[PDB]
UniProtKB/Swiss-Prot annotation, chains A, B:
Signal peptide: none
Chain's gene name: KEAP1
Full-protein interval shown: 325 to 609 of 624
Known outcome of mutating R91A: Loss of interaction with NFE2L2/NRF2. Abolishes repression of NFE2L2/NRF2-dependent gene expression. Loss of interaction with PGAM5. Does not affect interaction with SQSTM1/p62
Organismal lineage: Eukaryota, Metazoa, Chordata, Craniata, Vertebrata
Comment block on domains: KEAP1 contains reactive cysteine residues that act as sensors for endogenously produced and exogenously encountered small molecules, which react with sulfhydryl groups and modify the cysteine sensors, leading to impair ability of the BCR(KEAP1) complex to ubiquitinate target proteins. The Kelch repeats mediate interaction with NFE2L2/NRF2, BPTF and PGAM5.
The protein's name: Kelch-like ECH-associated protein 1
Keywords, ordered alphabetically: Cytoplasm, Host-virus interaction, Kelch repeat, Nucleus, Repeat, S-nitrosylation, Ubl conjugation, Ubl conjugation pathway
Length: 285, 285
């Protein structure tokens, strides 16, 4: 009975919400708020614990980029602070390999990071690894074949269709085949041995198009588009299906949750979040 | 029969309101809207004309920092554009010396300005002067003894308790005694030869504390606090009393207007604005 957790987000200002959706019965739980309101963060799970990584506190009286790492225990309904990252990372990408959290790119004020760091929960320590070949904020991250893929984003000048792959054993990055579409703030996940990149911003419009990377052919192929165009959407995989949560369509902050069935190549609206928001962190446990 | 004018502000989005309060009879006038919505702007008066300087248009369709200078004539109820500043300046500080407008600090996207520029209404021209020693956004500005004081703010990393002074004849800045409290977005004004810094934000809390700088002793002393904590408040002096307008208390956008009587060292609520808002520009004419 795993749940889809959504942490933080943005609607007029950064949000503290921690909510959990049950795809089986369609119910939503209201869990303990984040200690600091954050948008542009990422979520991940290690050993049944939910982690909220980086982001930014956007408030009417001023803004603060976050280097924070916070851990939520579903059994206790409590958030606990962890060691912070070396730098603040807003619009961060995150992936997990062997119980270690990789924090990828993101921004700190005018700085667009190419730097990458890894967290060890057993030691509560962060350590820098090899930086990416490109500076990437609003970057999508996917773990596939024990490699860490960094997809699209924004380098400070241009939104990107480029993508690269990290080899943990060799501690190095290599560029892979570029996507068909330029995407910053896309939802990036892994489903049935393929990397999916859904929505995002091409530098002009928020996108509803969805493409998938097949490792064997090293090609990106378009699949069925989402019903709603969205950037800064949350994404996850639950029981062989992709779930996209909220986002921004250029005018509205979406409460829509769409579900992709790979067997039928179709998207359907499954639920609505309690309120519209973009820039959430999402994970399943 | 001078009026307290409040221009722009923020509530869900940047506002276009121009309203004028009469402290003698408690009435509010609804004047011509600003041509462009703006929050984080500053207001000032030169030769009976009201000026709206800098700010930002925060809308659901995007955010744009403003380099605009607009002039309102109370006799015609008309806004007229003036020459723009060299750069956009959101959360700007403004002061007037010898009929010249000084535009101090503020932000442009991720940039935190230390730059300062001066407007000459007779020539409709802006010119840069010596930059401040510190980058300051959400900076409070006060003119005292023909010197321009820049108080607190945010440098891009930390909210500040520091303050500095500009010498127009020498074209140079000098650091002065730091405040007792770190304050960004405080209300800063001059009353009876003292600089007052009321409220503000420290990165964690909105403040109700008020302190005053005495030039002779070069010391900051706390006076009676305001009834409501507020950051990004509007401030002005009218007939020997300080008026604080709106702001943000960490939850609500205030419509509250408080008045400080220096003879009794007491604050009282005198009126309410027609709607709650933060980040207004305020001036008296
Ligand atoms: Na907030």
């Amino acid at each position: 009975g795993r749940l889809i957790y959504t942490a933080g987000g943005y609607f007029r200002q950064s949000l503290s919400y921690l909510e959990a959706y049950n795809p089986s019965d369609g119910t939503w739980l209201r869990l303990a708020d984040l200690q600091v309101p954050r948008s542009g963060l990422a979520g991940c799970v290690v050993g049944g614990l939910l982690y909220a990584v980086g982001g930014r506190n956007n408030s009417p009286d001023g803004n603060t980029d976050s280097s924070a790492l916070d851990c939520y225990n579903p059994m206790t309904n409590q958030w606990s602070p962890c060691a912070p990252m070396s730098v603040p990372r807003n619009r961060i990408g995150v992936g997990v390999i062997d119980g270690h959290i990789y924090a990828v790119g993101g921004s700190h004020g005018c700085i667009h990071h190419n730097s990458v760091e890894r967290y060890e929960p057993e030691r509560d320590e962060w350590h820098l690894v090899a930086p990416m070949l490109t500076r990437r904020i609003g970057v999508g991250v996917a773990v596939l074949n024990r490699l860490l893929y960094a997809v699209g984003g924004f380098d400070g000048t241009n939104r990107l269709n480029s993508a690269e792959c990290y080899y943990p054993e060799r501690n190095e990055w290599r560029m892979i085949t570029a996507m068909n579409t330029i995407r910053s703030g896309a939802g990036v996940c892994v489903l049935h041995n393929c990397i999916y990149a859904a929505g995002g911003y091409d530098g002009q419009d928020q996108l509803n198009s969805v493409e998938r990377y097949d490792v064997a052919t090293a090609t990106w192929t378009f699949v069925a588009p989402m019903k709603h165009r969205r950037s800064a959407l949350g994404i996850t995989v639950h029981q062989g299906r992709i779930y996209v949560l909220g986002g921004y369509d250029g005018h509205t902050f979406l409460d829509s949750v769409e579900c992709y069935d790979p067997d039928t190549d179709t998207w359907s609206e499954v639920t609505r979040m309690t309120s519209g928001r973009s820039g959430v962190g999402v994970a399943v446990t």
